[model samples]
Target: NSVSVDLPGSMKVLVSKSSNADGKYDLIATVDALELSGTSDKNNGSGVLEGVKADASKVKLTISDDLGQTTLEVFKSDGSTLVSKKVTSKDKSSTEEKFNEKGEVSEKIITRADGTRLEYTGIKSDGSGKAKEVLKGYVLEGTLTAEKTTLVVKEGTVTLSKNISKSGAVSVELNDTDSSAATKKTAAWNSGTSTLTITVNSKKTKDLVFTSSNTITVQQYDSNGTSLEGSAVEITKLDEIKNALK
Candidate 1:
């Protein structure tokens, strides 16, 4: 049997159904950048497609009837995975992964049909290709707590570590050289003031006022003088402060 079907999201597929000598059938199609294929064993068989190429992307699809799962992956021109999505019929669970140009997973989102979702982002790898940092987030009805995240950056003589608890508590430690108390700086968040207070060697030094949830104004003074005074800095640029704290 041969039929063309229009899928959701403006995708069109030409399905070709063929039966084998054993009376098993395989359904195959090419939906945009994806090569879709399935088979069943008894009058029905499921098969997987490997090394399929599409416009501007390499595609792979796996249909495992035994496991009741399907996975579709799209790769970049360099053969790096650009996106991957997997769905399991047995558990009603789905996972989607988005990768950076460097082939590193930048974001992973997992969800259940029962309205449960978990996400991991800001993934980083160490020199040895080991995961060095990742932020695991729990999303409820599309709302997320950005403050409750995890990050760790360890280099030659410096380390930056931050973790927020589910209770909306913050714990950040900035260490330089050794882990001595003198070389450590801790950051605290005041819910009342919506300010982040950082203490160097247990002594108050800098305060960052939260202009918005995503922006902060630095109120700091250097040994010489306040060089970079109050200015709205996006939270993403806080990595600079991590470098300095190192």
Candidate 2:
């Protein structure tokens, strides 16, 4: 996932939004980046954003290629910037800024698959600063299932978060028919049949998990989470998708 969607249980994709008449925002879906045409391009495509009638100061330019490489640079007085960016499998980009009038230099680099680093080294234009962050880099990764989430920290630290809960209910709340407000009920969902959610994240992300109150148990997985694979024959298999992706 690149950035995130405003809603849960959604995939990350390029999004451009606009408010409706009542001022509610909506997404442009994926927009098929290669469809709508504009300026000429190399490697296979081209693009040109709508222009500002007058002075579009401080605006930015976004350029993309067929390989999914895209870059955003300050449209500083027309067109331009550090001049270019090359990204492997849908880049992103990076920019290197020169020393202003002071002995300062700012730089940023990002790789769509690998990582990102940012730095700003300068004397604050007047020699008054302590928090002069000059370098920071990390591989950002995140995931949220019916289970947990992960994140990078300020330094090189890592943190995990989880909000695990479930069952005894799905059938009582969700529906697809045309129903009314005050009256709703159905063939009750009985987890009582014995199939259990088994709370994966709570156990995985917890400081200490007491599986059987006083007893603790650990599971084996090819990788991890929701992938808490189980037995081959007489058992429940949550992670049984097989090697279909290969």
Candidate 3:
């Protein structure tokens, strides 16, 4: 059996034969895309084709299942690597750190004090670290009344307001012992303490380069607060030299 075929955009296949020994035959083959889906069994050889259609040069794959997740990798036509990412229906939060030239954390925020109401958002280095409050403190007056408190750090005695319960009072008295006796206590403040948030924005000096595979693993956590190990999502790529020509 020999068959010569030509498939264009959308065509159907037809086979016909004429009578007599002088036989005449004509076969027409049309191209049409088909969609198929099914479950596999060891002894069964039947499946289902839900929706089939014809197309020029592409096919679509679809699946439906409960608790099913998928990841896709995109590539260039020349087989070169492109961008890759993962999507999962799990945790919605992630934590990362920014480091300096000495491999020290420059900025970070983490849950501290046993996951209580206190969170430490600060800048860290080799010498010292400082925290500026993102959330402000409030003083309560009556059953449903609250007032904003202010703490000022001045050159003199740090004062405290003896209004709200007297427990929220803050007095920062700096003592310069080695200095003259007349100026023993230096800086002081009164009333409520004000914590300010410090935001630092800088421009990139040079472009960034990735030598090896840079993988971003996303951890998926279940409803029971347990992390699913060995279930890392990664994005693989070749060594990218970004902003080189520019």
Candidate 4:
């Protein structure tokens, strides 16, 4: 019998088995010149992978490009190696820079539950002749999931604001009781399995507020340490404080 690993778009695969396969099964795998294309441009560029299968207890992967290569190693939980390989690219003819040449051109604001609001504006370019597009005020609100946080902007709502452009911006207001202020603290947002970690004055808390133009999703931690589904915000109410004190 033969085992084969398929390649996708100019990908090469190499596989090896350990000597003591009967006692402990170990496998080593490697790939070369797996091409990843960009969606926007075709004349863009590509990437490569490289590495080695030194033993049955460790697997290392190194990816490279025109600038340089970074190596990452992975070992089995039982201190065994499964595969080792390197990712590299020889074609540097066409390269598209990752970030925008003109930095953020707007400002973003975030408000915490304690009425502390933070406004972050992009800095201007220095004398180095680099252009800095400043982003001054914007608000990002979304569902906090195990993987990512989704942001959305709604029309006519005031608690948060979003300006969509090649450069984006968002602004937020912190006061909860002021409806005229255009924002409200509600328990209608859900933070999925991922913890919404916020570091405030050296203090890190998983419970965070998610506010946008439409609604906010807050992180919810259950008694069993599992994340709950649905939109729910756990605002620190004065009544809860009073009950705790009593």
* Alpha-carbon deviation at 15 in model 1, angstroms: 8.7
Candidates' C-alpha lDDT: 0.52, 0.26, 0.25, 0.30
Model 1 per-residue lDDT tens digits across residues 159-218: 555544557354555455656777666666776776656666656667655442323345
Which candidate, 1 or 3, has the higher lDDT? Answer: 1
Worst 10 residues of 4 by lDDT: 37-46
TM-score of each: 0.39, 0.25, 0.18, 0.20
* Tens digit per residue, CA lDDT, model 2, 68-112: 433322333454433222222333334344434222433223321
Could you list the CA RMSD of all candidates, in the order they appear?
11.9, 21.7, 25.7, 18.7
When summed lDDT is taken over every stretch of 10 residues in candidate 1, the lowest stretch is 134-143
| Model 1 spans with C-alpha error above 4 angstroms | 2-26, 30-45, 50-54, 78-82, 126-246
Which candidate's TM-score is highest?
A: 1
Q: What TM-score number comes out for model 4?
A: 0.20
What lDDT is reached at residue 105 by model 3? 49
Give me the displacement of residue 241 in model 2, in angstroms. 39
| Ten residues in sequence with the least summed lDDT for candidate 3 | 237-246
Model 3's C-alpha root-mean-square deviation from the true structure amounts to 25.7
Candidate 3 error regions (>4 Å): 1-96, 111-127, 137-156, 159-246
**Candidate 4 or 2, higher TM-score:** 2
Cα error, candidate 1, residue 150 (Å): 7.2
* lDDT (Cα) of model 3: 0.25
